C-alpha cells in the first residue's frame, strides 16, 4: 500500500523525494510518493479526492479538515519530552517598543494564518475574554480588522476585510501570490510571521514559544539577509508585563495541542505510523527527518521542533484537540447567518417595558444585531423559568438571584454591570474590623467567646456573610437549623438589633445600648445607637464589642474628621485593623485583599446554549453610543429619567457593562468566598 504524502512547496517536495529514496534504500515498506499541492488546504482536498494520502497539519487546520472534509489525525508530533504532544502560544514584540498585552489598538500585527492555532485561534480567542475585543453579530473579521492598524493574515484573500488583513503581506520574489496560505507568501507560518515582525512591516507576531530561538542565534535562514539575535525580542504576558523569550513557561497565552498527520477515515491508520516510526526509529544516522535546513527552509513535512512522532489512540479531531480547544471554538466561532434574529429581554414593570421598547428602537436605528424584543414576566424568579423554557433569552439579576438562576435553572452570566470606583453602595467588600491591640490580638479563627457587633439581623455584611462564613468554616455548628442559638453560644455577647422578635437569645442583645436615655434597647432602627454599620463600628470603638462586621468604607466614613459625632470626632483610622480569612491582619485600607466576601455586581443571565459573545458584543457596541449618561445619541442605557421608575433594565449606577472573562459560571461570578457563606446559611 503506497503512501502518497502531500507537499505544499518545491523545497517540501525535494525533502520528501530525498526521504523517499532514503526510505527504500533501507528497505522500508510500504513505498513513499510525494504529490505536490498549491497549499495545505488544497492538499486536504487532494486527500479527499483520493489523489493524495497523508499530510501534517496545525490544530486549526486539523479542525477544518476533520469537519468540512472529515479526515482523521493518525500520528502526532512530540516537540519536547517536557511539553510533550503540545506547545505554548506567545505574542512577541521587539525590545524597541512599549506594546504590552492590553495596548494593541491600532498596532500592526503578523499572524501565521487564518483559522490557525497560534496565529489566530488562540490570540483572537483570548482577546475576546482578557484583552477586550467585542464581536457583534458574529463578525469576527470586522472586529480584528478594526482593532489592529494593519495585519498580515495569510488565507484571508477572498474575505470582505481583505484590505486590512492582507495589508502587511508581501511574498515571493516577484511579489505574486500575496496573502496566500502557502509558503509562497514570505510571511506565512511561524517562520514568516516572525520574519514580518523583524523586517519592520509589523509590530507584533503571534507565534510558538520556540520559534524565536529557531530563527535567531545563527539559526536565521540565510535568505533573510540579516542574522537576528534572541535578545532583540520579548514576549507579552497575560498579567500585562513584557518578559524575555526564555521565560515562556510563565509568559504564554495558551497550551495548545500538537500538529498531526491527517489521513482519510477510509485510509488505514496503523500503516502510516508503522512506516514513519520505521524511519524515525532507524534515523535519529542515514536521514534527519525533523531537520530541514539542507533544503533552504523551515518546518518541511514536519516542524523542526519535532523530536518524535507518536501513535494516537482516538483518531478524531474532537479527541485530539483539547476539549477546552473545541469550547473556545464554538463560542468565538459562530455562523454569522444562523444566529437568533431576536434577543428577548425580560421586563418586570410597565416602565421597564417602555425603556426596553425605546432601547430596541435606538439599537435598531443604529444597525446593531441582534434585535431586542421585550417580554414581560411577573417575578425575577419567574423570568428564570421563562428564560430556560426558551420563551425569554436574557435578564439582569442581583447577587442572590444570580445564585438561584445558575444553581436551579442552569443559567450563565453573559455580561456584568460595572459601577464607578467611588461608588460602593452596590458592590462592596464585607470586612471584620477590630481595635489595634497586639497584646490582645486574635484571628478570624479565634472568634469564640469574643464580643461581636453586627449591624442588624439579616444585614448582609453584618450577619448573613459573617455567620454564613463561620458555619461553612466549621466554627458555628448549629443543631436542627437553629442558627440563632448557635451564634449566641459562639460569641459571649453580641449586639444584633432586630424588629419583631419571637425567641431571640438574650446574648444577641447584650451589647445594645438603645436611646440616649437607654430606652429602645436592641431595636431594629436608628433609635438603637449601635444599629447599622456605623452603629456596629461605634459598638467596637466604645469597647462594647471586640469585632464589628461592616462594609469596607465604614471605618473611613467614621474616622479622620469624616464624622464629627462626639463618639467618632477624634477617631483615627490607624487604630483599627482587618482580619482576613487566611489568618493575616491588615490596615483598614487593604480591604480588597483582606475581606470576608465581596457583594457581587449584577449580571445578565442567559441559557448555556445562548452565545454569550453576541450578548456582550451587542451591549458593548450599544454602550459605545448609549452608555454615557450625557451622550448625544438619543438613548441612555444606564439612566431612567424618561420613565416612571428607577434602575430599569440596569441599575442607574452602572457606568459600563463588562465581559464575564473567566467567571463563566454562576459560582465564579458570585465568587467562592461569597457562595461559601450563602451555602453555609442554607443549612
Amino acid at each position, epitope marked *: 500500500m503506497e503512501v502518497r504524502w502531500c507537499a505544499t512547496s518545491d523545497p517540501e517536495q525535494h525533502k520528501c523525494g530525498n526521504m523517499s529514496e532514503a526510505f527504500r534504500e533501507a528497505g522500508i515498506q510500504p513505498s513513499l510518493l510525494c504529490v505536490r499541492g498549491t497549499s495545505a488546504d488544497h492538499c486536504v482536498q487532494l486527500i479527499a479526492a483520493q489523489e493524495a494520502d497523508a499530510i501534517t497539519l496545525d490544530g486549526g487546520a486539523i479542525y477544518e479538515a476533520g469537519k468540512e472534509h472529515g479526515l482523521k489525525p493518525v500520528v502526532g508530533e512530540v516537540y519536547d519530552q517536557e511539553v510533550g504532544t503540545s506547545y505554548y502560544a506567545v505574542a512577541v514584540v521587539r525590545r524597541s517598543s512599549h506594546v504590552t498585552i492590553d495596548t494593541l489598538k491600532g498596532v500592526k500585527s503578523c499572524h501565521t494564518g487564518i483559522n490557525r492555532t497560534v496565529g489566530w485561534n488562540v490570540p483572537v480567542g483570548y482577546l475576546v475574554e482578557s484583552g477586550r475585543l467585542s464581536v457583534m453579530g458574529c463578525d469576527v473579521l470586522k472586529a480584528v480588522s478594526d482593532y489592529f492598524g494593519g495585519s498580515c493574515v495569510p488565507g484571508a484573500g477572498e474575505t470582505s476585510y481583505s484590505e486590512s488583513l492582507c495589508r502587511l503581506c508581501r511574498g515571493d520574489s516577484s511579489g505574486e501570490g500575496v496573502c496566500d496560505k502557502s509558503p509562497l507568501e514570505r510571511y506565512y507560518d511561524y517562520s514568516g510571521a516572525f520574519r514580518c515582525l523583524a523586517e519592520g512591516a509589523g509590530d507584533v507576531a503571534f507565534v510558538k514559544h520556540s520559534t524565536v530561538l529557531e530563527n535567531t542565534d545563527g539559526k536565521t535562514l540565510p535568505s533573510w539577509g540579516q542574522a537576528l539575535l534572541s535578545q532583540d525580542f520579548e514576549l507579552l504576558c497575560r498579567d500585562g508585563s513584557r518578559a524575555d523569550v526564555t521565560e515562556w513557561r510563565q509568559c504564554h497565552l495558551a497550551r495548545v495541542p500538537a500538529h498531526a498527520v491527517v489521513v482519510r477515515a477510509d485510509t488505514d491508520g496503523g500503516l502510516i505510523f508503522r512506516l514513519l516510526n520505521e524511519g524515525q526509529r532507524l534515523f535519529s544516522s542515514s536521514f534527519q527527518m525533523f531537520s530541514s535546513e539542507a533544503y533552504g527552509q523551515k518546518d518541511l513535512l514536519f516542524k523542526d521542533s519535532t523530536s518524535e512522532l507518536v501513535p494516537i489512540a482516538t483518531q478524531t479531531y474532537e479527541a485530539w484537540l483539547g476539549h477546552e480547544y473545541l469550547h473556545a471554538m464554538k463560542g468565538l466561532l459562530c455562523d454569522p447567518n444562523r444566529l437568533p434574529p431576536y434577543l428577548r429581554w425580560c421586563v418586570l414593570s410597565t416602565p421597564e417595558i417602555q425603556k426596553c421598547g425605546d432601547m430596541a428602537v435606538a439599537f435598531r436605528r443604529q444597525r446593531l444585531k441582534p434585535e431586542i424584543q421585550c417580554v414581560s414576566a411577573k417575578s425575577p424568579q419567574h423570568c428564570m423559568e421563562r428564560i430556560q423554557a426558551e420563551q425569554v433569552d436574557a435578564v439582569t439579576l442581583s447577587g442572590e438571584d444570580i445564585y438561584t438562576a445558575g444553581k436551579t435553572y442552569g443559567l450563565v452570566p453573559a455580561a456584568g454591570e460595572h459601577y464607578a470606583p467611588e461608588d460602593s453602595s452596590n458592590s462592596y467588600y464585607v470586612v471584620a474590623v477590630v481595635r489595634r491591640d*497586639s497584646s490582645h490580638a486574635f484571628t478570624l479563627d479565634e472568634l469564640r467567646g469574643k*464580643r461581636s457587633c453586627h449591624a442588624g439581623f439579616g444585614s448582609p455584611a453584618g450577619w448573613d456573610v459573617p455567620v454564613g462564613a463561620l458555619i461553612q468554616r466549621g466554627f458555628i455548628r448549629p443543631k436542627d437549623c437553629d442558627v440563632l442559638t448557635a451564634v449566641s453560644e459562639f460569641f*459571649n*455577647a453580641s449586639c444584633v438589633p432586630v424588629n419583631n422578635p419571637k425567641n431571640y437569645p438574650s446574648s444577641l442583645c447584650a451589647l445594645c445600648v438603645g436611646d440616649e436615655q437607654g430606652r429602645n434597647k436592641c431595636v431594629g432602627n436608628s433609635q438603637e445607637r449601635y444599629y447599622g454599620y456605623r452603629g456596629a463600628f461605634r459598638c467596637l470603638v466604645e469597647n462594647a464589642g471586640d469585632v464589628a462586621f461592616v462594609r469596607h468604607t465604614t471605618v473611613f466614613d467614621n474616622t479622620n474628621g469624616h464624622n464629627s459625632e462626639p463618639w467618632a470626632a477624634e477617631l483615627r483610622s490607624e487604630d483599627y485593623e482587618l482580619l482576613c480569612p487566611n489568618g493575616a491582619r491588615a490596615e483598614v485600607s487593604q480591604f480588597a485583599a483582606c475581606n470576608l466576601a465581596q457583594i457581587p455586581p449584577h449580571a445578565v443571565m442567559v441559557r448555556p446554549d445562548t452565545n454569550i459573545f453576541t450578548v456582550y458584543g451587542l451591549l458593548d457596541k450599544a454602550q459605545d453610543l448609549f452608555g454615557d449618561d450625557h451622550n448625544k445619541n438619543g438613548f441612555k442605557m444606564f439612566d431612567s429619567s424618561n420613565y416612571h421608575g428607577q434602575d430599569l433594565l440596569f441599575k442607574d449606577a452602572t457606568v459600563r457593562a463588562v465581559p464575564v472573562g473567566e467567571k463563566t459560571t454562576y459560582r465564579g461570578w458570585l465568587g467562592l468566598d461569597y457562595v461559601a457563606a450563602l451555602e453555609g446559611m442554607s443549612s
Partner: antibody
Framework: QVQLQQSGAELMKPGASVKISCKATGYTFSNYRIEWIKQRPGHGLEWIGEILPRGGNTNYNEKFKGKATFTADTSSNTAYMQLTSLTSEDSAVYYC????????????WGQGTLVTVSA | DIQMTQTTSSLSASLGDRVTISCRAS??????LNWYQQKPDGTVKLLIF???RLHSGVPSRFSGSGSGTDYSLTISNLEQEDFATYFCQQGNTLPPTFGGGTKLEIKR
C-alpha cells in the same frame, strides 16, 4: 470624668489574705478590662493580671498564679483582687488601671492601695 | 516575658532643658511601647502610646521616638511639674512589662 477610686491602706498579719477594691465611675464598667499592678521600692512595676468585667474573663501573670484572684461586680461597678498567704514580699502599693482597649495603654489609674504585711 | 530595661535610674536637669529618657526591650516590640509619668504622691499619668502618639491632654513638650527594640521619651523646655519618675511599658505581648523607672531630679 472617668475615675477609679481604690480602697484604703490595709495592714495584715503574715499568712492572712486581703481584698482590695477599686470602684469605677464615669464610664461603662462592663466594657473595659481592669489591670492590677504591684509597686515595691526598687522593683519597678509588676503586672499581676487583668479582668474584663463583662463575663469575668481573667488573665493572671504566672509568677502570681495562686496568690491573686480577681472578681468584678457589674451591678456595683467595683473590681476586687484578693491576695492569699501574705508575706513581707507582698508589702507593696497596688494599683488598678483601665485598659483603653488599644495599644495596651492604661489611660486611667487608681490612687493606689498600701498593703503592709506585719506580725 | 519581654524585659524592659531603662538605661539610668536617676537623672538631673534644670528648668528649660531638653531631656531624653530611654527604654530597651529584650525583643522587637514593633513600636507597641507606652510611656508613663509617676509623681511622688503615687499618681500615674499616661503620656505617650505606641512609640510617639500623645495621649489627649498631654503637653507637647513630651515627644516619643524609637523603633525595633530601642525607644526613648523626650521632654523639651523642661518645667517644674516634669520632675517625677518616668516608666516605659510594652503592649506587644502579655504579660505587659514595665521599666524600672527614671527619676528626674532638679540640678543645683
Amino acid at each position: 470624668q472617668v475615675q477609679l477610686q481604690q480602697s484604703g491602706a490595709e495592714l495584715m498579719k503574715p499568712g492572712a489574705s486581703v481584698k482590695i477594691s477599686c470602684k469605677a465611675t464615669g464610664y461603662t464598667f462592663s466594657n473595659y478590662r481592669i489591670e492590677w499592678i504591684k509597686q515595691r521600692p526598687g522593683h519597678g512595676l509588676e503586672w499581676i493580671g487583668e479582668i474584663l468585667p463583662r463575663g469575668g474573663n481573667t488573665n493572671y501573670n504566672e509568677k502570681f498564679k495562686g496568690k491573686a484572684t480577681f472578681t468584678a461586680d457589674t451591678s456595683s461597678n467595683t473590681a476586687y483582687m484578693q491576695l492569699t498567704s501574705l508575706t513581707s514580699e507582698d508589702s507593696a502599693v497596688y494599683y488598678c488601671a483601665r485598659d483603653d482597649g488599644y495599644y495596651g495603654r492604661f489611660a486611667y489609674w487608681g490612687q493606689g492601695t498600701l498593703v503592709t504585711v506585719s506580725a | 516575658d519581654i524585659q524592659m530595661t531603662q538605661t539610668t535610674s536617676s537623672l538631673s536637669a534644670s528648668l528649660g532643658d531638653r531631656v531624653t529618657i530611654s527604654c530597651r526591650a529584650s525583643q522587637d516590640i514593633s513600636n507597641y511601647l507606652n510611656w508613663y509619668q509617676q509623681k511622688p504622691d503615687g499618681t500615674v499619668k499616661l503620656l505617650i502610646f505606641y512609640t510617639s502618639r500623645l495621649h489627649s491632654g498631654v503637653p507637647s513638650r513630651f515627644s516619643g521616638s524609637g523603633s525595633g527594640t530601642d525607644y526613648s521619651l523626650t521632654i523639651s523646655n523642661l518645667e517644674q511639674e516634669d520632675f517625677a519618675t518616668y516608666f516605659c511599658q510594652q503592649g506587644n505581648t502579655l504579660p505587659p512589662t514595665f521599666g524600672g523607672g527614671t527619676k528626674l531630679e532638679i540640678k543645683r
